[PDB]
Symmetry: D2
Amino acid sequence: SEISRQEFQRRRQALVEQMQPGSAALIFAAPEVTRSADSEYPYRQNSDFWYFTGFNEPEAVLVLIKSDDTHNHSVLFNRVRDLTAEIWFGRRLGQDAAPEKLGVDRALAFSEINQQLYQLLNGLDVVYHAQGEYAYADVIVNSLEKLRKGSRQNLTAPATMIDWRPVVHEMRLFKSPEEIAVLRRAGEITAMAHTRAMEKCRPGMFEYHLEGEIHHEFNRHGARYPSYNTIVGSGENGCILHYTENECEMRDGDLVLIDAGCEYKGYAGDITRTFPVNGKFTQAQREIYDIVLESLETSLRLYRPGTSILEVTGEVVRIMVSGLVKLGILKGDVDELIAQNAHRPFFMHGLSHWLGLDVHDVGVYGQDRSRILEPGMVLTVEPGLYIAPDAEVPEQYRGIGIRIEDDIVITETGNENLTASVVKKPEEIEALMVAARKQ
Amino acid sequence: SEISRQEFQRRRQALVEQMQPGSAALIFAAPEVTRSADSEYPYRQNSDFWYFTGFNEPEAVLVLIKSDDTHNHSVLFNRVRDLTAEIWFGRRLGQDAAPEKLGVDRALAFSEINQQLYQLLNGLDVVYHAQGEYAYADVIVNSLEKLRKGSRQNLTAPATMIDWRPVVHEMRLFKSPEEIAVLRRAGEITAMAHTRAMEKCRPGMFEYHLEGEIHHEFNRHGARYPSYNTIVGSGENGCILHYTENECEMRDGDLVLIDAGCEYKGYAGDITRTFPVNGKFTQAQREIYDIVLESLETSLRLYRPGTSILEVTGEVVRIMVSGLVKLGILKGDVDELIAQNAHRPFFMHGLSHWLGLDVHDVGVYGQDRSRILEPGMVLTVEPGLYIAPDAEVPEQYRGIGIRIEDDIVITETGNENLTASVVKKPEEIEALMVAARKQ
Amino acid sequence: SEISRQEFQRRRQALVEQMQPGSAALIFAAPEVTRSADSEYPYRQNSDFWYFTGFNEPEAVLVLIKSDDTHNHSVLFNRVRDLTAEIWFGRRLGQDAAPEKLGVDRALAFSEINQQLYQLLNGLDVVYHAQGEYAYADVIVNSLEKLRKGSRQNLTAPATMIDWRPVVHEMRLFKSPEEIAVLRRAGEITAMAHTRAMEKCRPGMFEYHLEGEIHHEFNRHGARYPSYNTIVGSGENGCILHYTENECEMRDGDLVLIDAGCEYKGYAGDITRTFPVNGKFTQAQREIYDIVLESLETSLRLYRPGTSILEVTGEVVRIMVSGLVKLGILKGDVDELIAQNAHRPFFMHGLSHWLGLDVHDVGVYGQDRSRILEPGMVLTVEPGLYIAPDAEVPEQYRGIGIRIEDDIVITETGNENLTASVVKKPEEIEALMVAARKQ
Amino acid sequence: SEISRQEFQRRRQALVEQMQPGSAALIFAAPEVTRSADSEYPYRQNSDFWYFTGFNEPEAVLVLIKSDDTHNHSVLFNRVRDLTAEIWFGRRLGQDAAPEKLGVDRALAFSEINQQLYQLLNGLDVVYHAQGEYAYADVIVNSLEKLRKGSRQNLTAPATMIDWRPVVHEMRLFKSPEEIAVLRRAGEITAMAHTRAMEKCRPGMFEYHLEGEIHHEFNRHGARYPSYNTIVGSGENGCILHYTENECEMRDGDLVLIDAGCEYKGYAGDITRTFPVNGKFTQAQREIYDIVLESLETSLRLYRPGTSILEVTGEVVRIMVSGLVKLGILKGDVDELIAQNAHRPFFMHGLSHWLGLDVHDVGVYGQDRSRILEPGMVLTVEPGLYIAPDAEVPEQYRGIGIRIEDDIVITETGNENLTASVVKKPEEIEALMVAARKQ
Ligand SMILES: [Mn+2]
Ligand SMILES: [Mn+2]
Ligand SMILES: [Mn+2]
Ligand SMILES: [Mn+2]
Ligand SMILES: [Mn+2]
Ligand SMILES: [Mn+2]
Ligand SMILES: [Mn+2]
Ligand SMILES: [Mn+2]
């Protein structure tokens, strides 16, 4: 599944629809980035620029001009076709093929941006620009100065600049059926990688070995890159939320927390599964795992239109405090403990965040993530309990870090879980591992 | 194999040895880099900062102070130990453990760099700084302005600034036995990945599938990342030197050029192998492959102390022109054709480049890469012939891109080939592929 | 005459009136400026910041907040009272006395601007800021980034930024009776300086001597500084529009063009008078002077509400071409010559420009300065003829540069000439000079 | 008197003499500076650029190239001759006339600086550049990056950058006989201005009136601009060291402290004289004035080769403490009071500073201004006593600010006072004022 040219065009029309007449929206591509000396990291297009073009080249600017309420057109600045630059670094779309290919009205060489942009903004009343996103973009836009100082040439600069991100990000917050299909495939690809990791894990292997298995699985399904740096934290490393070293050998008797997700057609998969390295939870590991699983299951039953992340979080907190008191990790009255946020040393992050072109996707959460949920919103559900190796708790719980994380989409009557194809019930994990351990 | 703390210390002493008395050398860590929004690319330490520390954290500065000819000491500025930043993002070395761990005399918090640096440069005569490398580094160093304007406080700024790169890069150009062992392991890891790719390749698979196989092989041996973006160009894509899209399905009857190398302990492996997708070279494919192979073999026999890349290139050019004339691709007198650089449309890059902490390693080449080779120098050997799909040559050669690339180390009496463990003779490639194709 | 605190307040209310509810206008002071090393030029406040405050200190920002349609208040950031900085450099208004003194509601220390500004813009919908005026102002305003990234702290940034200059400059274009009184005094002060210069001029004196006389006259009336760099161009120097060297000794038989105006209470006086150095126009000097004077007189009769600078310019051009044809300087048909802009080599600048807090005052001119004139507009009237020393014209006209420039205010039924108190009719100039030359 | 072309050439040769072979010194002109909107302050050339050229145009760079120990040449980048830019703003030297005029070997258009500079620095070992002086200069110099990255074009960048200021400023610290003649004329011009001010001062005049008299006197002698902003502090304003408002009406019975100096041929005059507004010192005014005068006279007797500013300051401090104890302003033992720096609340600045192309001239002072004085050094001598209007001292001394400041040149056997032509003994001041007050 993917996002076609037609949908990119619809998104552009939806923005223009919200734009004032006599205005221009400017959307810039991500700059290339250095890894070391003259080598660069694999190119990652800006999420917002991608959302409107599906074009993976740097040095490109999308210009949406709304002359009036009926008249509007698009202009793309992109790298010119160059034979020696292409023989060396790869093919370029160029200007001739851009209009038909992307669905834009015109295409100009990026090399001419400073000679053409001011001419496109001349006499407009508003310019929509995401100021402060990229320094090179700001330099180009600020160079407005030509218009401001060009009255003798009969040039006028738009006196209003509006940040298009709040509107674009609210658009991104609500997925189209096509986007949900893409995310559904990403969740499925990420689930297969996690299953594979569970089936490959053996005491003595290095944490990065599971990362290697996961990235090979992402790749074979057409998702070349992870949507974020893979986390493989065994033993004490599981208490580090974003532990990315993945350098320790995995110990017999320790749990391993895997946080990994692919990037398929620009969209993020986001899955976390914690399981025993030897295929068998110990009693103390199983006791913490149960609290985190109930937190997840209860959340999955509750998430729906009408509720909110904040509301569902209160349910998880009560589940957590209850279990921590029962195990002896917390001491006191449940309601009193809840009132003093006593769960915080063991659960210090949020239960959810939006999911889309970015793993921590754009969109307003409302204070304390209280915004009412509506169909089309995609988010993660990732309770966790992390007992520090030196926490003042019963000895057998120290160094246990557990998180169990799925990706869901709010539907008309609940939510659809995009990553339930990888097991999370302890007996199922053990059963899965036991079958793999026998060949 | 690896580079221990002792060797990092020796390198620091070797720099100090070359430094003037009453001076300070400043070496900055690479800044973290954004991939998208709030997600960052996997951290890659600056090669020069790594060369002297083996420390993989950002926001760190190595300060080597040479008080006089007998007295010198080191100061490291690095991120302070922070409990909440570590619970979230990972462990930090901190200041207490830095001296013993890295072998530096003192360690100060990076947060105090602007309050301490000027005090360290006060009254020195020279400051060695790689100006223009990183903007943040330049801002810190330029803020010298405190010393210049602080005469009333009895402060004086060094009036001389020397770029330490020419000296450090000349150091990097000559590998220690330990570095050669690391590169030898990197060449071996990269060769196993290429062998694996040859054995997995089947018509119909996508170019990125081979990239997935290669990166999984790098990973299992402890080389998490490639030293450069993997190139898998089948058919016409083989004529694009650094084709990294790797998006086309591989065709029965086409050749596939794979350019890939791992990064092991900071060092680059750099291997290219071109072979038939179906396990069998066609006559026309075999005819071009032979010219490129002879170019490589002859070069491997010749490379040694006393010669140069330029000198060996002349040998390759004659081999190329000779074969292109014999095949009908070039027309005329060999010596006349050589004199007019007639091979250039088919071989447009250099035969070698240095290899080390960077795939295109630092070090002076001499005009036209004429510097006399000496033991300890590591370089690649990567003749290639690329016949454009529209080249005015016999129809059967169009769209053929071939490159065969090994990594070598110049020794006292020749060179040691670090990547010969992956086959390159056509019968050997076919034999290898034929055995894999039967299971 | 001057502009009191009440008027500065009215101007602030008039801006707020035009502002949208839920917005803030930011107006920054001019930065101090270096003359050489550690010495600075005499401080000149930004015209727009002055227009709203009458406050002559650097490091100050005026913040006008419009909470809604009925509620609005002002906050001033200004240098804190410091005993040692004041003993050395001068008194500072400080925060305690600012509210009453300037008429603002609150005053905060400039040192706290970055800790307070974002708090003042939090939750507003619009921020009016003159982007690109001062780099330091832009850095402060862009540091919006705190609001954008502070959603977890419940902070929101205004998504709209509007340039307040077009509105403020349109305000500045129309003078209040008080401003016209100030400009009237400035025109009178500048006229006395020009009269003094005419009465002091003697062959052999240096051009800068007249500049010295002029600046001494400005000073004695309370106008310490010129509104622009004084121009004293004798002989060939008169053909250089903004000749400011004023280094040549004045020759018997040459004309001297003086362009000078004071800055009184922030407003510009702008007067040009050209006269013979020896007190007597030669026939050739008198013949060119007559054309320029008729151009000025005709313009002074015509300027009124309903007409425009462009319209009056056409009248001047016909006068010029007519006289140049009659003298032999131009050859051909008057109407044909006018049609080919044949006067341009001799009159290459505009006839008028606005006058106010800046000598070349803000305000839209309309294409080709065609905007219809209205009461309250202040402008200059400064025809000129400059015959280059090598111009292909009758020998006796070469090296003659003449300009005669007055400042006027458009009234309900014409214009009031603010600088007619300094003579411009040749017989009057000669009469004036002849009387001075006898003591 | 002035500095001719030959001397500018000698200075350039003296720098080249101290430069290493295979190097280039870069000296940039001061950028033009905005006063308001499109009007600029009168141009002030950078002191160091002036010191080597005597050229008063912006957008110019002096390049001194020392090929070896015998071979060296100069290249000047300066604004090209442009007919329309000159008709409007003034004449430009241009490239054709530059070599002969300034005495440089070649002159190139400033517009070509980025295409030519790197070519001039190619292959050199050292570049002398005053980093951080001007941002535009740094941008030009840093754009070295072309050389660093141009090895394939056979370009090499100098690896050493040396700040030429310490050497140039040490040169500037020692005046040539010609420079001393210029400073002698500047001191004489400034003394006539101060005499004029004393003779014009009358109760009721405004402080800025004396500033007007002073600047008119500077001007008539060919010193158009002050070397620093004129200070005219009457009454309590005299206790503000650099009071430049000069806005108060001068009161009968108050003292007026005038700090003013001209800028003649680039050099600074620097004189301070404090006298009664009504021509008669009161007893309390006379008692403080005597302490400051003795401090000055004693210093003038002492200043010579072999001593230092620090040494002479100790003499002044004893004189001050002695007189303050005798008047009742200080209480205690003189030696004890001196030991606790009890004079500091009344004398808080230094006794001297260097004088030359900058009023606070370049040159190393040594810790606490202890550098041994040598012939050729020019400095000021400006003891002062400032009793705050609220100081806990006898009522009659409050609000008295007095400073008496001369400019001297250290000679072989003492010093020559360059500004003694304006009276400083109280009876002489009164006598001077009394004669002027009668007409
Ligand atoms: Mn996750
Ligand atoms: Mn997540
Ligand atoms: Mn390669
Ligand atoms: Mn290579
Ligand atoms: Mn004028
Ligand atoms: Mn004018
Ligand atoms: Mn002074
Ligand atoms: Mn002084």
